Design goal:
Chain A: Homodimer. Heating induces higher order association. Forms homotetramers at 80 degrees Celsius. The complex is a heterodimer. By secondary structure, chain A is an alpha/beta fold. Chain A has five helices and four strands, in the order E-H-E-H-E-H-E-H-H. Classes of the chains: A alpha/beta, B alpha/beta.
């Protein structure tokens, strides 16, 4: 099974650890964002780091909240994260998000392909 | 009629000794000690006997293979598992066993089946009732509720109501001897 990393978004978080993850051979990253999801567009280098890395590995966005999903069309921070290549996790649980990404990576490494699959309701995990 | 129970270990099967050792019951011994005496035509298979915190992705490959080689032979399968990673396993198995021919029900308990106030008997009986329902798929049974396995999360760490269906309706809920689906 492919190695995935799950990092909680917190105020001031840098893109540092994400480069390190890619450099370490991690094949996917899940970020638990705030609320409906997104990435700060100022105050850190996180968004710029993600614009780069989202091309090399799937970077998936779920929420730190327990209920309701993410919807990255809802807020500017979400829409900018989408523009940066972030893959939304919709209303999936965190366990489904992580395991789904791991399962997909067993079959492919094409990030745009991974993105279609993450967004497709494979077995009832997601409302697509 | 025909049910397979697969053991993975977990608190449900835990047995600790005053001299400090930690042992584990096979899945047949779990059912017996839980007082389930009406599970006739049930086979038992012990796949693991581990604290579920030890679970790694290799274990999901082994479990899925084992599930694949049994889904045609049984009408339902129940997997007993530690609660800490129960929802990761139920989620991964859902992706690995895409639309199985039978109900596959993951369960466990917050209190070892050896204790007199255990939730094991309730969870096992719920799992057994649903494994006979003819409703195919991967599910979690817990605290009298049946939940889609790929929509389940552990929400509490020290309560019998440890698991919830997140953003999705509960599949069935126990009322007496009856699982109610609405």
């Amino acid at each position: 099974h492919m190695a995935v990393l799950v990092i909680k978004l917190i105020p001031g978080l840098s893109g540092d650890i994400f480069r390190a993850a890619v450099e370490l051979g991690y094949r996917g990253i899940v970020i638990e964002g705030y609320g409906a999801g997104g990435i700060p567009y100022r105050g850190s280098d996180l968004l710029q780091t993600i614009e780069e890395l989202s091309k090399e590995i799937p970077i998936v966005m779920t929420t730190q909240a327990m209920y309701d999903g993410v919807d990255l069309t809802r807020y500017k921070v979400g829409r900018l994260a989408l523009r940066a290549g972030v893959i939304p996790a919709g209303d999936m649980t965190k366990e489904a998000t992580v395991t789904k990404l791991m399962w997909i990576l067993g079959h492919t490494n094409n990030v745009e392909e991974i993105k279609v699959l993450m967004r497709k309701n494979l077995v009832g995990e997601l409302r697509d | 009629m025909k049910i397979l129970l697969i053991g993975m270990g977990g608190t449900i099967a835990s047995v600790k000794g005053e001299n400090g050792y930690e042992a584990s019951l096979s899945v047949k011994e779990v059912l017996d000690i839980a007082g389930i005496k009406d599970c006739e035509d049930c086979d038992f298979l012990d796949l693991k006997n581990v604290d579920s915190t030890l679970i790694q992705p290799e274990d999901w490959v082994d479990l899925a293979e084992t599930l694949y080689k049994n889904v045609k032979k049984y009408d339902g399968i129940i997997v007993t598992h530690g609660t800490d990673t129960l929802a990761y396993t139920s989620s991964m198995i859902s992706f690995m066993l895409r639309n199985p021919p039978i109900p596959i029900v993951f369960t466990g308990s917050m209190i070892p089946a050896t204790e007199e106030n255990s939730d094991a008997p309730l969870n096992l009986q719920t799992a057994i009732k649903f494994a006979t329902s003819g409703i195919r798929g991967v599910y979690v049974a817990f605290n009298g509720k049946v939940m889609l396995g790929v929509r389940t999360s552990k929400v509490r760490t020290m309560s019998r109501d440890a698991f919830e269906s997140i953003n999705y309706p509960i599949i069935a809920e126990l009322r007496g001897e009856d699982l109610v689906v609405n």
